Amino acid sequence: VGWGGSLQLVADMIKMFFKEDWIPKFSDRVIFTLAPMIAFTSLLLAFAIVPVSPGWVVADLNIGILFFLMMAGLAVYAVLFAGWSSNNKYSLLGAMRASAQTLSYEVFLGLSLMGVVAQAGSFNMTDIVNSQAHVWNVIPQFFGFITFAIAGVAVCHRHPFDQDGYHIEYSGMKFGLFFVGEYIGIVTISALMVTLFFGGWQGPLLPPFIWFALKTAFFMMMFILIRASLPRPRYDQVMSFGWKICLPLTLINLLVTAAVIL
Amino acid sequence: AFAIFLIVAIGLCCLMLVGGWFLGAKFYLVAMFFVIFDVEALYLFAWSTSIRESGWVGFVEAAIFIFVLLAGLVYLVRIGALDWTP
Amino acid sequence: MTITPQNLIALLPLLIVGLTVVVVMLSIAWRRNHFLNATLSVIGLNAALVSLWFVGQAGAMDVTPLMRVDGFAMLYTGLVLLASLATCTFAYPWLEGYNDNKDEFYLLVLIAALGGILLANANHLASLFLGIELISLPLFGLVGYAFRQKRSLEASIKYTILSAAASSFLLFGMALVYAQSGDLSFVALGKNEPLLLAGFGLMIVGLGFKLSLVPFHLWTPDVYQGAPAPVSTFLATASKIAIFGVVMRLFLYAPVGDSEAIRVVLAIIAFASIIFGNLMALSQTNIKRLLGYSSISHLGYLLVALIALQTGEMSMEAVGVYLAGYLFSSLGAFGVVSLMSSPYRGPDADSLFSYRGLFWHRPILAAVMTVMMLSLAGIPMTLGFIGKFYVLAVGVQAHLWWLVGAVVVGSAIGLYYYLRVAVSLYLHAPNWQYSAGGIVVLISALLVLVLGVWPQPLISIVRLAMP
Amino acid sequence: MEFAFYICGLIAILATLRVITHTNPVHALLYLIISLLAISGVFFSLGAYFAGALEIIVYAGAIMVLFVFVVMMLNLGGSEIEQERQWLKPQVWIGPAILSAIMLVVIVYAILGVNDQGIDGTPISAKAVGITLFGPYVLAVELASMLLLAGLVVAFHVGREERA
Amino acid sequence: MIPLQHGLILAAILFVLGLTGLVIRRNLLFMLIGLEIMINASALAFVVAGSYWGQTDGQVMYILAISLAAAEASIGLALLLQLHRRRQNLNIDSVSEMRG
């Protein structure tokens, strides 16, 4: 096997290829070929706005944050189209239930990020990372920080468990495609949590680019750490402690920031 | 830039497709709550973009906006529409 | 401009009603009680009528570029508020027999009052859109209130698709005008190239659905048969009363409405509205479809005044008084229809053949329907005649001979069905808020009689309001 | 932006022909999302920056999720295909199209009558739209909120729950 | 550069294609789809109209236009719930009583 811990992932990828793909009868084909891409490619293009360095930001397009939220919306269409292509009632209601949870916890992420936008006063990601020159936006938005963390681990990240059998129907190269996509998904949430809340490109005594990527891994690892730590809640209970205690939190946090800024 | 990166991404997608075929109910209404509340909070997305120069009048304006929204959420919770759901 | 206390006193109608929605919604979530919600909603609408005096302390002025507050808007806000007051008092006796969730009704009527009192105050094309849709969403949903019947849902769905369709025509027209003009403000508009006129015709389509004009009148029978009679009180009176104010203000302010190209098209619509209303209205044996047929003809008489708004200043008060008379006549008639359904009764059985007798059953209520039904026609001693008389005078003043002749022959045709219902209440027979509902229609009967025989005090109010 | 504007318009024009023509509702939903991403490309071709992103968050990402939910929970696939295509004969399809043709060409003639006066690529950012919305258009936002809240009440009422 | 007529022609065509779709097709679901196809076409005219003159007059009620669309779509889907729950046919001729 490989001599690196992460290189074993590559080994798995090799153990993933050269399996044939069977076409289920009386099932759609366009979603069968595209529903993998919406779980993979959409969060891959959520990395098109990450300033790892001001000389190596992917795209200097005029609005940054919205282009994160856009992709975070298209994240629900993949869960649905897989469920409609499965054409099984055991999977149909599970896809509905999984997509309902994604829609429930997609609400908090946009309203939590507006507080960081308001203290920075802009959307564009270069304007943010020049705002974190001396103080990062993790001291003031503690409530915005924890809710963005909860909203990130709810969308296509299996942290509330309850995942049914809707990805069972794909087992060929598309199973690795969903797996590659969720790995890509977790690194962009960790990267965006660092570069929007913390400071990317800081480097007090070491190259800043290294100093940032170091924090990126810490969150990425930390998400895995908490994934293995917190047990499964009841699927009834996550909606009970969703809109009740999370939607008021971002709005009252946004008013606290509006009083602080003004 | 963005267009070059998008072209690179879609070319990689086409290449992996080439390699792939070469190798060989009820109570959904919580969903509709989202659909209202996204468009409700989209006005807040505009406001925090320029909170500073709208100033206190925009702040008083935005406070009444989200108080209406928060009153609606309490109505939804306390009616019994927003609870455990399929 | 910013917010000054003059602006808040001017905005006081839109404010009291909005505070009422919040308090009503909190009260619904607290207790879910019919008595408390009815009391809270009617108190807010009565508080809005009281605060009309306070905005009368303020002069003719702007709040934002979206709105202009004049004394014209003071009277139209008052018409909408009494219709909202009228519909809640007619809904309590109908909803006492409803099986469950009896409390969402006042919340939707309160939203519709916000929409009505927002189309009274208009100065920009966007306020026109925020008002039309604020009132439609309760009218989207309240004709579908009590969807347990097989026709309420039918009526709601037909009105839903068609009203969204009209709003899409209005919005597409609203932009095609703004392509030429640099601003969408009514005054700033028109500062006769075909795109502006073509955009104007699209807004006529989107406005003439809700005003029930001749090629758009198809919804007015069906939903009026399907909707609850408390909803029909609001759908007949408040919506079109509020909507007619904004369509009149657009032609008064905009210099494009001065041109004869739009004038000829609106006159032909008015001509055909009278004719295509009053001929198909004869054969009906249903009272709700009968009132819905008459609504098309009444909005046509309003248009034959509006076409001569630009010739002589008497058209302002003419439109105002016919709207006041039309409010009182329809509220009394539709209140008696709803007052016959004192329980929910599932589907109410109301028809012209079902209204044989009704004088030896309930004599007072038959008198109210007869007085109002003679007031709809043009019989004197009733306020409808004075309103009819000004629209004839306006058409004579502006030399619209075909249009004034259409009103007379339309009156001649339309006398027939009003008189059958008046005499059909004299053939041989085949709780506390109910007494309150009787008081509302009986109060309106006294008012239409005394303002038909003695019409000067209502004119003094109208010339007080007109700028 | 000119070739970009042209390609997004033709994709929107064509995908709209497909969604009024096709029969499978999920394919119709898919083609209309192509239409909505095409329209956001049109907005970014024109320069409306707070519209192209705004349309994808909400119009291609909130409203159409609700459309997709209802078409999978009715489970209406496999029923009402044969007679539904028997209703749409091409001779029937021609009929009302000539009706829509009359207004479409009048609009084309009415818009061809004016001069060109071609605009440039003016970029309109969200910095001033949030200012303008909470300044002169202050009333619109609050009243706009009531449009949504009213939709909430009626959608809970018509989407009333029961024992089933 | 793109002139007014090219943009507005895109708007006009889309509205006509929308309107046409709703009229021709039987199912209430496709009528709702046609409503959304024609409410965005009107909004498409507004943005190109509002971006002709180069100010914030498009995006200031493009949002109101989609707020109406969101509210209409929510109630329209709710109406079809009750319609299939009462009767399994989904065509609009099912609820077509009181003819003439």
Author numbering:
A (entry chain H): 52 to 214, 223 to 321
B (entry chain A): 15 to 38, 66 to 127
C (entry chain N): 1 to 191, 199 to 437, 447 to 483
D (entry chain J): 1 to 164
E (entry chain K): 1 to 100
Provide the authors' original text about this structure.
After density modification, the resolution of membrane arm improved to 3.7 Å. The model of complete membrane arm, including the previously missing subunit NuoH, was built into the density map with local resolution better than 3.5 Å at the arm center and approximately 4.0 Å at its periphery. An additional density belt corresponding to the lipid nanodisc is clearly visible around the membrane-embedded region. The structure of the membrane arm in the lipid nanodisc is very similar to the crystal structure of the detergent-solubilized membrane arm [RMSD of 1.1 Å (1888 Cα)]. The density for the N-terminus of NuoH (residues 1–52) that includes HTMH1 and a part of HTMH1-TMH2 loop, is completely missing in the reconstructions of the membrane fragment and of the complete complex. The structures visualize a complete chain of charged residues connecting the Q-site with charged residues in antiporter-like subunits. Thus, analysis of the protein translocation pathways indicates that in E. coli, no continuous proton path exists between the Q-site and NuoN. The density of the cytoplasmic half of MTM8 is poor and fragmented between residues 255 and 265, indicating the existence of multiple conformations. Conversely, MTMH8 displays localized disorder next to the π-bulge, indicating possible involvement of this helix in the structural rearrangements associated with proton translocation, and to our knowledge, this represents the first indication of specific conformational changes in antiporter-like subunits.
